[PDB]
Amino acid sequence: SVPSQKTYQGSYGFRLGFLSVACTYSPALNKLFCQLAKTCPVQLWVDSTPPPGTRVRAMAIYKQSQRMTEVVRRCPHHERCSDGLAPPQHLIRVEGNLRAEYLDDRNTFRHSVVVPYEPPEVGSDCTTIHYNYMCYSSCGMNRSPILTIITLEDSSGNLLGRDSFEVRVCACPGRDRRTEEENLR
């Protein structure tokens, strides 16, 4: 199957926000450009606070239809060359959270990383999660574009909200964003 990428704000009005260049986001392209393994601040915005027990899942899928059923995973080189938490095959890691769970779906084999949902930090109207992408889009992904899908879920895994963004993991994020944006224009 293929995970849904349908945007769904849900009952809590859930949606994402985003902040050399380590990571840069293009609203026009709904695309995040980032360097390998670097900190990617992704913001969780809600109109109402979900209850304790709410979880936040991040999963990558291929954007292109001809590769949608394939599991996005690290290339062999990058799986070999770690915090001891993220499985070496997982593309997406969470940085700075002592409660990240790395999961593999029993039937689809897809990877995901989940952390407990936490209300906004002081001085902020959103909750920020720091993600790291462990393989380049060019490796493997081999130039195929991917989407990161973030889902807000209850403790049993039921959907509460969904949002998503394209991601390109690359050596020069700032330059590649300009290139793709100028091309859009």
Q: In the bound complex, what is the minimum distance in angstroms from residue 35's beta carbon to Zn ion?
A: 13
18's tokens: 């985003």
Nearer to Zn ion, 86 or 135 (CB): 135
Cβ(126)–Cβ(120) below 8 Å: yes
7 vs 138 by CB, closer to Zn ion = 138
Kindly state the smallest distance separating residue 43's Cβ from Zn ion, in Å.
Answer: 27
Residue 77 annotated as binding site: no
Q: Containing H/E element for 12?
A: none
- 159 with 13: CB under 8 angstroms? no
Tell me whether residue 58 or residue 135 sits nearer to Zn ion (CB atom). 135
Least Å from the CB of residue 134 to Zn ion: 7
34 assigned to a ligand binding site: no
Alpha-carbon distances, residue 98 vs 80, 83, 86, 127 (angstroms): 24, 12, 12, 16
| 139 assigned binding-site residue | yes
Residue closer to Zn ion (CB basis): 88 or 119: 88
- Binding site residues, Zn ion, CB under 5 A: 75, 78, 135, 139
Determine the Cα–Cα distance for residues 167 and 179; give it in Å rounded to an integer: 15
Residue nearest to Zn ion (CB): 139
- In angstroms, the CA 63 to CA 143 distance is 11
Shortest distance, position 143 Cβ to Zn ion, whole Å: 12
SS3 content of the chain, % helix, strand, coil (to 5): 10, 35, 55
130 assigned ligand-binding residue: no
Residues annotated within the binding site are 75, 78, 135, 139
Residues annotated within the binding site for Zn(2+) are 75, 78, 135, 139
